[PDB]
Each structure stands twice: as structure tokens, then as C-alpha cells.
Amino acid sequence: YTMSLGAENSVAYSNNSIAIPTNFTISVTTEILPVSMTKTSVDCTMYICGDSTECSNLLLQYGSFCTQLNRALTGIAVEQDKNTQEVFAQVKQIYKTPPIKDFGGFNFSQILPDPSKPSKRSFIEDLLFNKVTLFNGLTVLPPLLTDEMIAQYTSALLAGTITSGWTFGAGAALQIPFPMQMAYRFNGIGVTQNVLYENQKLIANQFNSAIGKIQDSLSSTPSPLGKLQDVVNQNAQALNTLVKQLSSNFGAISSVLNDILSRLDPPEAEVQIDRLITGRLQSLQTYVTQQLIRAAEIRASANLAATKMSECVLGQSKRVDFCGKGYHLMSFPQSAPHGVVFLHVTYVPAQEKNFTTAPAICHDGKAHFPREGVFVSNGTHWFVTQRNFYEPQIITTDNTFVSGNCDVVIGIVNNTVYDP
Amino acid sequence: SPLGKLQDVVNQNAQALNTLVKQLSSNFGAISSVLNDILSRLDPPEAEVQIDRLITGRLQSLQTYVTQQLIRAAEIRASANLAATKMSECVLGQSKRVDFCGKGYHLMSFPQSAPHGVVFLHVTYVPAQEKNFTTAPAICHDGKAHFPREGVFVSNGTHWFVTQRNFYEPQIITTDNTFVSGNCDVVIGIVNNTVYDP
Amino acid sequence: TRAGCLIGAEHVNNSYECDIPIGAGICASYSIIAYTMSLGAENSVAYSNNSIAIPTNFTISVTTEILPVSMTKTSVDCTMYICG
Amino acid sequence: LTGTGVLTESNKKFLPFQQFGRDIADTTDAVRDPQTLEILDITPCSFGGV
Numbered sequence: 004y005t006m007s008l009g010a011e012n013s014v015a016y017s018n019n020s021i022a023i024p025t026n027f028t029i030s031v032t033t034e035i036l037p038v039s040m041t042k043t044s045v046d047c048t049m050y051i052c053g054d055s056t057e058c059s060n061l062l063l064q065y066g067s068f069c070t071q072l073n074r075a076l077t078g079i080a081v082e083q084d085k086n087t088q089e090v091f092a093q094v095k096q097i098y099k100t101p102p103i104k105d106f107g108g109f110n111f112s113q114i115l116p117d118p119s120k121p122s123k124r125s126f127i128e129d130l131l132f133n134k135v136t137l138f139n140g141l142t143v144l145p146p147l148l149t150d151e152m153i154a155q156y157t158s159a160l161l162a163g164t165i166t167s168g169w170t171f172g173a174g175a176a177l178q179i180p181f182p183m184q185m186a187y188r189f190n191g192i193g194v195t196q197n198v199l200y201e202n203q204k205l206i207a208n209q210f211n212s213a214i215g216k217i218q219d220s221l222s223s224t225p226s227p228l229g230k231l232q233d234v235v236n237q238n239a240q241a242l243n244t245l246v247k248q249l250s251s252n253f254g255a256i257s258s259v260l261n262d263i264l265s266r267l268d269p270p271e272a273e274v275q276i277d278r279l280i281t282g283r284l285q286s287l288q289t290y291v292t293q294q295l296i297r298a299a300e301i302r303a304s305a306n307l308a309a310t311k312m313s314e315c316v317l318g319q320s321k322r323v324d325f326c327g328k329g330y331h332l333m334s335f336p337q338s339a340p341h342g343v344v345f346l347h348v349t350y351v352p353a354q355e356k357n358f359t360t361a362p363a364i365c366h367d368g369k370a371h372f373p374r375e376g377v378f379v380s381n382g383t384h385w386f387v388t389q390r391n392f393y394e395p396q397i398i399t400t401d402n403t404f405v406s407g408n409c410d411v412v413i414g415i416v417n418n419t420v421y422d423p
Numbered sequence: 424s425p426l427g428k429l430q431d432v433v434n435q436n437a438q439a440l441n442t443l444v445k446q447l448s449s450n451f452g453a454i455s456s457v458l459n460d461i462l463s464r465l466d467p468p469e470a471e472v473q474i475d476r477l478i479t480g481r482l483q484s485l486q487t488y489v490t491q492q493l494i495r496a497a498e499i500r501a502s503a504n505l506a507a508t509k510m511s512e513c514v515l516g517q518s519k520r521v522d523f524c525g526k527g528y529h530l531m532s533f534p535q536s537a538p539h540g541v542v543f544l545h546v547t548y549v550p551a552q553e554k555n556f557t558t559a560p561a562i563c564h565d566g567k568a569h570f571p572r573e574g575v576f577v578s579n580g581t582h583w584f585v586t587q588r589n590f591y592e593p594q595i596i597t598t599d600n601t602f603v604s605g606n607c608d609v610v611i612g613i614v615n616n617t618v619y620d621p
Numbered sequence: 622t623r624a625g626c627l628i629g630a631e632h633v634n635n636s637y638e639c640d641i642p643i644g645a646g647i648c649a650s651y652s653i654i655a656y657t658m659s660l661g662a663e664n665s666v667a668y669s670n671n672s673i674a675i676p677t678n679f680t681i682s683v684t685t686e687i688l689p690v691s692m693t694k695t696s697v698d699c700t701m702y703i704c705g
Numbered sequence: 706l707t708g709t710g711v712l713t714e715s716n717k718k719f720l721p722f723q724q725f726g727r728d729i730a731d732t733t734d735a736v737r738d739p740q741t742l743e744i745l746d747i748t749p750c751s752f753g754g755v
């Protein structure tokens with residue numbers, strides 16, 4: 004069939020009408036980003052020849068391709084180490100959460116490290132690590148940073164986040180009450196602190212429920228870490244195809260050098276060896292070039308991950324959809340086998356209600372405009388409220404400003420402005 | 424070692440050129456690496472065969488150099504796009520993005536030229552000389568809760584004040600810099616204090 | 622070590638901001654000593670429900686950032702290079 | 706079948722008619738010694754970078 008783009012609805016647009024949400028949902032979204040790939044170095048001489056002096060003798064006359072490929076792979080490995088260090092090593096101090104976990108009812112025991120000592124990893128890190136499942140001149144160099152240190156870096160970042168907010172990313176960590184941090188973040192997205200201080204229990208419950216839902220999705224739903232799995236699969240496929248290409252004759256009598264030497268006279272035997280050299284060297288160069296392209300793509304992904312961590316973990320981002328669907332509140336990093344996982348805490352309006360609206364209020368022959376808010380209309384009376392939450396207030400000179408008479412504004416209504 | 428990136432780029436380009444020139448001096452399995460000797464010593468059929476093998480080797484090496492140059496060009500273009508974004512967002516304006524233009528709250532930026540690059544001097548604001556204080560979410564006065572407009576309530580042990588978050592400038596709590604949002608029986612942590620009315 | 626073995630460097634129990642990275646968390650510095658790298662200063666913030674830290678002073682810091690913009694423009698005559 | 710490496714005792718069990726074994730990517734891993742009909746594990750001796 005022809006695919007359907009989605010639900011087909013028309014917004015109830017009207018000249019005098021507005022829709023304002025009266026309640027909210029705290030959503031937590033998971034984002035997976037590859038950071039680094041396995042560091043592989045291939046001995047060009049051994050792969051092409053396989054410890055045969057005569058093959059080496061003709062190979063050396065054939066160029067300096069071995070040096071080029073070796074330096075390319077070494078640069079790729081160093082770049083992988085740089086990517087990992089850049090993404091995670093953002094803080095200069097390893098912060099710690101206090102033993103007393105009183106965060107206003109917000110629960111973080113699923114993302115904080117646990118005393119059980121499973122490599123100092125939380126469920127989400129443990130779930131991700133469990134979820135992802137993984138000799139003729141090629142070798143794999145271990146990463147500079149072990150999983151334990153990456154987990155420690157993540158724990159330091161998360162502890163600094165909850166205990167200090169965004170201050171530790173812009174200087175020295177400054178302790179803050181968690182409720183105050185959440186209120187500051189609400190102020191950032193344009194909602195007054197009163198909403199949090201009056202709905203703190205609901206917000207904490209919603210956040211805990213969202214974290215539990217993320218844990219359930221990771222535990223049960225599969226195919227959530229496709230990007231890391233795809234990267235690992237591509238690397239494995241490249242290595243396997245390279246090893247298989249080693250077992251191809253490339254148009255000679257045999258694919259193994261020992262047999263060719265043991266059965267053939269030196270001139271045509273060396274000719275066959277040379278054709279094998281050409282085929283194997285070309286295949287190795289193809290592998291190196293594809294590895295370089297993959298390294299560039301992974302570096303782009305790692306730069307994106309570092310930007311996300313700096314702009315969403317160390318601070319609050321006003322960029323739309325950069326760190327989750329909805330008004331971004333906070334973000335939490337988590338380690339992954341070759342990547343990072345971001346839990347984006349966002350604010351989503353819900354339970355909207357229609358309200359009539361006027362650009363300004365004409366009182367005493369002068370026009371009044373809201374300072375920061377909207378003149379919604381109840382059937383009984385006109386009210387001024389904030390855009391992102393329905394908190395009606397009596398129109399007053401305190402929250403309105405005058406900008407002349409009321410004969411120039413299109414759509415102005417007549418109402419009284421209370422003077423206190 | 425402060426300009427390692429530019430030095431590294433120059434070194435990589437020089438290394439690629441040098442290895443290309445050296446590869447020109449390889450026989451690629453032929454009798455000689457120089458065409459003149461092959462032509463002057465050999466009959467046309469095998470001489471042309473040797474020439475063809477040199478052609479294959481040299482052309483393949485040139486293609487390898489071109490491919491690596493293309494990859495380096497893509498990486499340099501990514502870096503240049505980042506530099507242009509930094510210039511537009513930090514030199515032509517003030518950026519709220521954290522750590523995008525320096526450690527600390529970004530103030531202003533200055534560009535400077537470099538032999539094959541640009542140098543940004545990021546002027547940033549870094550808080551220092553911190554002090555501890557006792558805070559409260561709101562103030563309960565006259566049976567109603569007062570919240571700061573833009574700031575925080577702190578107490579110098581015995582007297583509550585309202586100041587800005589990023590600098591310690593205590594001020595007397597007043598209805599001018601606070602707003603009321605109902606009674607004081609729902610806020611967790613609220614205290615009792617007087618709100619001065621001017 | 623997990624990266625192989627070291628000859629000529631002696632292992633120490635202390636941890637420092639290491640200089641020469643070796644692998645698997647082990648790295649060496651200057652006799653040549655090998656150790657597990659230290660991530661940094663290890664401190665705990667004095668978190669309380671009613672405690673804040675507010676700065677009373679500021680520092681204007683200037684930081685230098687280097688960014689490559691372009692590389693040398695090289696054109697190679699393919700025919701002349703290959704044949705001469 | 707020619708090769709180079711270190712031989713060691715193996716606990717894997719081969720079928721009677723079956724002489725040697727290959728891992729993924731078609732690389733030899735174990736061989737049965739003809740004289741004693743015994744299974745030997747084959748691993749290449751240590752190589753690497755300095």
C-alpha cells in the first residue's frame with residue numbers, strides 16, 4: 004500500500020482563540036550516539052607475504068605502501084582515543100554524590116553507581132553493556148580509557164549535575180538544593196518557579212515513573228542500540244572480508260605462497276607471487292580507505308556527542324529538538340560499550356484548553372499590554388496568564404504596561420485594569 | 424606546542440607529498456625505476472611491459488594520495504565550518520551555549536589570523552571566592568508565600584536577603600523584588616520572615 | 622599489563638595525572654614509573670537541603686582556541702608525473 | 706597440511722572420520738595427529754608490536 008504520513012488533523016485556528024495547556028508531563032528520552040570504534044592495526048608485510056623473505060624482497064621494491072597504511076591506521080587509532088577523551092573527559096574533578104540521597108523525592112538510584120560493585124556500574128550502564136554482545140598480521144589495540152574509568156567519568160558528571168546544576172561546567176561546582184535547580188530550569192523554559200514548588204510531588208513521581216519506563220524498555224524492548232551494533236558489525240564484516248580476501252588466488256595457480264614456491268620455477272613462480280602481491284595490497288588499501296571513511300563518520304558522531312554533553316549535560320539548551328522532543332530540562336549521560344547514552348529529561352505540555360484572546364486591553368483610553376504573558380478570556384472575565392501554563396491572574400498595572408491609546412491596536416477589547 | 428593543529432596539518436600534507444615523490448622512485452617489480460634506462464636497454468615488447476607495470480604502480484599510488492587528500496579535505500572542511508560557526512556565534516554575538524566558546528560564561532570573543540587557520544581569544548566570566556549561605560524556597564509573610572522574581576533567598580545566619588544567583592549582592596526582601604503565589608502551607612521548606620513594604 | 626608487558630619501567634601504587642599513555646588505564650611518566658592514571662582531584666560537594674554557595678567575586682579569563690581553516694592547494698599533473 | 710604455531714592439548718572432541726578443524730573465517734584451529742589419533746589445539750606463537 005501507499006504509506007500514510009500520519010494522523011491527518013486540522014488545528015482549530017481562530018482569530019480570537021488560543022489554546023493553553025493546564026497540566027504537564029515530564030518525559031525522559033533515550034539517545035544513543037557512537038563515540039569510538041575498535042582500534043585495529045594491521046601489519047602490512049606479514050598480511051601480504053606471511054614470513055617469506057623472497058616475497059618481502061620483491062614487496063620492498065614495490066613501494067612504501069606499508070608505511071602509508073600503517074600510519075593511516077595509527078592515526079585512526081589515535082583519533083579514536085581522542086574522540087573518547089573529548090566526549091567524556093569534560094570535568095577536571097571527580098565529583099561524588101552525598102551519602103544522604105534527599106533530592107526532594109527525585110529518585111536516581113537507577114542511574115547512580117551502586118555499592119554492589121559490578122564494575123562500578125548502574126542498571127542503565129549494566130543493562131546497556133549486557134544488551135550489546137560482541138591472526139595473520141592484524142591486531143586490536145586496547146582503548147586508553149577502560150570501561151571502569153568511563154563509568155567513573157559518567158558518575159562524576161552526573162553527580163556534578165545533580166549537586167551543582169550547570170555551575171560546575173562553567174567554573175567551580177556550587178551546591179544547590181535540587182528543588183531550586185529544577186525551578187531554575189523551569190524558569191529557563193519560561194515557566195515560573197511556583198509551578199514546580201506547588202507540583203513537586205507530581206513532578207518527582209512523573210520523573211521516577213519515566214526512569215522506570217526507560218529501564219523497562221531497555222530490559223524488554225530490543226533493537227534499541229542499533230547504532231553501536233551496526234558499527235561493530237561493520238568493523239567485523241570489514242575484518243572478515245579482509246581475511247577471506249587473503250585466501251584468494253587472484254588469478255594465479257594457487258592462493259598459498261608455499262605451494263607456489265614448492266612446485267614452480269623461480270620466474271613464473273615469482274610472477275604468480277607478484278600478482279598475489281598486487282591483489283592483496285589492493286585489497287588492503289581498499290580496507291584502509293573504507294576504515295578511514297568510517298573513522299571520519301565516527302569522528303563526526305563523536306563531535307556531535309561531545310557537543311550534546313557540553314550543551315545539555317553541563318547546561319540547559321534552548322535549541323529546539325537538539326536534546327529531545329519538548330522543552331529541554333536536564334540530561335543524564337550513561338556509558339555504552341563504544342558510545343554514550345543520553346537520558347533527556349524534557350517538559351511536555353498536556354491537557355490544553357481553549358481560551359479567547361485579545362492583543363491588548365483598552366482602559367481609561369489607553370492600551371495595556373502584558374509584560375510577559377497572555378490576556379486570556381474566561382466567559383466571566385479577562386485574565387492574564389503565562390504562555391506555557393494556565394495560571395490566570397487578575398489584570399493589574401503591576402503585570403501590564405501602557406503604550407499609548409487604544410485606537411491603533413487591531414483587536415483590542417475594553418476591560419478594567421485593577422490598580423492596587 | 425600551542426599551535427599543534429596547524430603544525431600537524433602542515434606536517435601531514437608535507438608527508439603525503441614526500442611519500443608520493445619517493446614512490447615515484449620505485450621500480451614496482453620492473454628491471455629499473457627510470458623509464459629512460461628501460462627504453463635504452465630493452466626491446467619494445469618487454470620494455471613496454473615494464474613500462475605498463477610502472478604505470479599501474481604509479482597510477483595506483485597517485486590514486487591513494489588523491490583519496491587521502493580528499494579525506495583530509497573533508498576533515499578540514501568540517502573544521503572550517505566549525506570555525507565559521509564559532510566566528511558567527513561568538514564574534515558577531517554572545518553565545519549561551521555552554522563550553523562552545525571557552526570555559527565559563529562567555530562574554531565576548533576576538534579573532535586572530537594564523538598561517539592556515541584562525542585563533543579565537545575567548546573572554547569569559549568565571550565566578551570565584553564563593554561563600555556558603557542558608558537558603559529557602561520561599562518566604563511566608565502574612566500567611567502568603569513570596570518567591571524571588573529573579574534571584575535567590577539567602578540568610579547571613581540570622582537575617583534573610585534576596586540576591587542574584589551569579590553574584591553576592593544581598594538586598595532587603597521587598598514586595599518590589601518578590602511575587603506572591605498563594606499561602607505558605609504547600610511549599611516544602613518555607614520559613615517565616617518579614618517582607619518589607621515600601 | 623593488559624596492553625602487554627613493560628620492561629625498563631617499575632610499577633608504583635600512586636596515581637598521578639599521567640603524561641605518556643600506554644593503554645588499559647596504565648601509563649608511564651618520569652626513573653621511568655608506570656601506574657594507573659588518576660582522573661583528577663577527588664572531592665565531595667557539601668550538599669544540604671538548605672545550603673547554597675554564591676560567588677562574591679569574579680575572574681575575567683581569556684582562553685585561546687586554535688582551529689584549522691584551510692590547507693595548501695596542491696595540483697599534480699597526472700600525465701607528466703606518471704610518465705615524464 | 707603445513708603451518709607454524711605452538712601445539713597444545715585440546716579438550717574439544719572431533720568426530721572419528723574428521724581430521725582437522727577451522728574456526729570462523731576458515732583458519733585452522735585444531736588437528737588430529739595421525740599416529741596417535743589425538744586432537745591437538747593450534748595457536749600461533751606470540752607476535753606483536755614493540
Ligand SMILES: *[C@@H]1O[C@H](CO)[C@@H](O)[C@H](O)[C@H]1NC(C)=O
Nearest residue numbers: 025026027028205209353354
Ligand atoms: C497531569 O497529568 C498527569 C499524567 O500522569 C497526572 O498524573 C496529573 O494528575 C495531571 N494533573 C492535573 C492537575 O490534572
Ligand SMILES: *[C@@H]1O[C@H](CO)[C@@H](O)[C@H](O)[C@H]1NC(C)=O
Nearest residue numbers: 104106108109110111112113
Ligand atoms: C528509588 O527506587 C528504589 C527501587 O528499589 C528504592 O529502593 C529507593 O528507596 C528509591 N529511592 C527514593 C528516594 O525513592
Ligand SMILES: *[C@@H]1O[C@H](CO)[C@@H](O)[C@H](O)[C@H]1NC(C)=O
Nearest residue numbers: 015021022023354355356357
Ligand atoms: C478548541 O475547540 C475546537 C472546536 O470545538 C476543538 O476541536 C479543539 O479540540 C478545542 N481545543 C481545546 C484545547 O479544547
Ligand SMILES: *[C@@H]1O[C@H](CO)[C@@H](O)[C@H](O)[C@H]1NC(C)=O
Nearest residue numbers: 380381382383384385386395
Ligand atoms: C471563569 O472564571 C471565573 C472567575 O475566575 C470562574 O469562577 C469560572 O469557574 C471560570 N469558568 C467559567 C466557565 O466561567
Ligand SMILES: *[C@@H]1O[C@H](CO)[C@@H](O)[C@H](O)[C@H]1NC(C)=O
Nearest residue numbers: 017018019361413414415416
Ligand atoms: C477576527 O476574524 C473574524 C473572521 O471573520 C472577523 O469577523 C473579526 O472581525 C476579526 N476580529 C478582530 C480582527 O478583532
Ligand SMILES: *[C@@H]1O[C@H](CO)[C@@H](O)[C@H](O)[C@H]1NC(C)=O
Nearest residue numbers: 365368409414415416417418
Ligand atoms: C471601548 O470604549 C470606547 C470609548 O467608550 C468606545 O469608543 C469603543 O467602541 C469601545 N470598544 C468596545 C470593543 O467596546
Ligand SMILES: *[C@@H]1O[C@H](CO)[C@@H](O)[C@H](O)[C@H]1NC(C)=O
Nearest residue numbers: 578579580581582583584595
Ligand atoms: C546579618 O545581616 C544583618 C542585616 O540585616 C546585619 O545587621 C548583621 O550584622 C549580619 N550578620 C549577622 C551575623 O547577623
Ligand SMILES: *[C@@H]1O[C@H](CO)[C@@H](O)[C@H](O)[C@H]1NC(C)=O
Nearest residue numbers: 180558559560611612670671
Ligand atoms: C532540610 O530538611 C529540614 C528537615 O530535615 C527542613 O526543616 C528544611 O526546611 C529543609 N531545607 C529546605 C531548604 O527545605
Ligand SMILES: *[C@@H]1O[C@H](CO)[C@@H](O)[C@H](O)[C@H]1NC(C)=O
Nearest residue numbers: 563566607612613614615616
Ligand atoms: C509562619 O508563621 C505562622 C504564624 O501563625 C505559623 O502558623 C506558620 O507555621 C509559620 N511557618 C513556618 C514554616 O514555621
Ligand SMILES: *[C@@H]1O[C@H](CO)[C@@H](O)[C@H](O)[C@H]1NC(C)=O
Nearest residue numbers: 550551552677678679680681
Ligand atoms: C577578586 O579577585 C581578584 C583577583 O585578581 C582581585 O584582584 C580582587 O581584589 C578581588 N576582589 C575582591 C572584592 O575580593
Ligand SMILES: *[C@@H]1O[C@H](CO)[C@@H](O)[C@H](O)[C@H]1NC(C)=O
Nearest residue numbers: 715716717718719720726744
Ligand atoms: C556433543 O553434544 C552434547 C549435547 O549438545 C554436548 O553437551 C557436548 O559438549 C558435545 N561435545 C562437544 C565436543 O562439543
Ligand SMILES: *[C@@H]1O[C@H](CO)[C@@H](O)[C@H](O)[C@H]1NC(C)=O
Nearest residue numbers: 721737738739740741742743
Ligand atoms: C600408531 O597408531 C595406532 C592407531 O591405529 C596407535 O594405537 C599406536 O599407538 C601408534 N603408534 C605409535 C604412535 O608409535
